[PDB]
Amino acid sequence: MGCSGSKDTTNSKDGAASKGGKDGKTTADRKVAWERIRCAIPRDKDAESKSRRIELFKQFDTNGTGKLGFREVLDGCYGILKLDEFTTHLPDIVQRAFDKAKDLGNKVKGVGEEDLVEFLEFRLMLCYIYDIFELTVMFDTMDKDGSLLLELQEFKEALPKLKEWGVDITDATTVFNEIDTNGSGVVTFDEFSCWAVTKKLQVCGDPDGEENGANEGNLE
């Protein structure tokens, strides 16, 4: 049934490998890029953050609307921020960030269900990315090399280390089962991290822009 494909390479019933064209990349390259990015992407709504926040916003909002969606946002970075260089295939990274952000936005407070992102939900979105990056770069090292899976091993080591990150999974084993959904025996970065980033977001989602963090001072 047809004959004109000649011959080519072959493989077995599995191929957890990739080919970028004799490129190559590891913590080294991932470290320098994430270093410039991390520096660009805010993480504490500081003076430099507030400004940038408005800058990048006016960017995607070059159409004049104030109500952006996902598709428009995706291409925005995918074409401007160009996060591909560092992370291989990140159209999904922003996808999950845009979705959750919007939803998680109302839940806490209440502004009505919609589908677009506002200056507020936008701030939460960026946070998702920034965090998701810290993890990947923080796991690849405490984990294996050409791998992206997690196991009870890095779990007990990351459980504590994670606590420092900013979140507090408290109960571990119980969570390992929750985040899990394939029923195999392990969890992938994007999954384990999702639980982290999100949490760190619901806890640090506190609208600062003011002065009311630590206590005022000593009493007696």
Q: Residue 118: exposed, middle, or buried by beta-carbon count in 10 A (0-12, 13-18, 19+)?
A: middle
Q: Kindly state the tokens that stand for 20.
A: 């970028």
Cα 64 to Cα 77: distance, rounded to the nearest angstrom: 17
- Any bridge partners for residue 187, and if so which? 150
Calculate the dihedral angle through the C-alpha atoms of 104, 105, 106, 108, rounding to the nearest 10 degrees.
Answer: 70
* Domain span holding position 111: 1-220
DSSP single-letter state for residue 86: T
Residues found in the chain: 220
Element (H, E) at 162: helix 152-165
What CATH number has the domain bearing residue 102? 1.10.238.10
Residue 143 known to bind ligand? yes
State residue 200 phi and psi, 5-degree precision.
-45, -25
Residue 191 known to bind ligand? yes
CA angle 126, 132, 134 (to 5 degrees): 105
Residue 58 known to bind ligand? no
Residue 211 known to bind ligand? no
- How many separate domains does the chain show? 1
Cα 101 to Cα 68: distance, rounded to the nearest angstrom: 13
Q: Kindly state the tokens that stand for 188.
A: 């992938």
SS3 at position 188:
strand
- Any bridge partners for residue 117, and if so which? 68
Q: Is 89 left (phi over 0), alpha (psi -120 to 50) or beta?
A: left
Residue 154 known to bind ligand? yes
Nearest to 117 by CA among 184, 150, 126: 126
Residue 75 known to bind ligand? no
Q: Kindly state the tokens that stand for 168.
A: 């507090």
Sign for the pseudo-dihedral over CA of 164, 166, 170, 171: negative
Residue 180 known to bind ligand? yes
Ranges of H-type helices in 25-151: 27-40, 47-60, 71-79, 91-108, 119-142
Residue 145 known to bind ligand? yes
Residue 65 known to bind ligand? yes
Which residues lie below 8 Å from residue 159, measured CB to CB, with a gap of 6+?
169, 172
Cα 139 to Cα 135: distance, rounded to the nearest angstrom: 6
Which residues lie below 8 Å from residue 25, measured CB to CB, with a gap of 6+?
88
Q: Are 202 and 104 within 8 A, CB to CB?
A: yes
Cα 191 to Cα 196: distance, rounded to the nearest angstrom: 9
- The CA distances from residue 19 to 120, 137, 140, 214, in Å, are 39, 21, 19, 50
Q: Is 86 left (phi over 0), alpha (psi -120 to 50) or beta?
A: alpha
**Residue 56 burial (CB count, 10 A):** 19
Cα 97 to Cα 91: distance, rounded to the nearest angstrom: 10
Q: Are 156 and 150 within 8 A, CB to CB?
A: no
- Count, in order, helices (H) and strands (E) of the chain: 8, 2
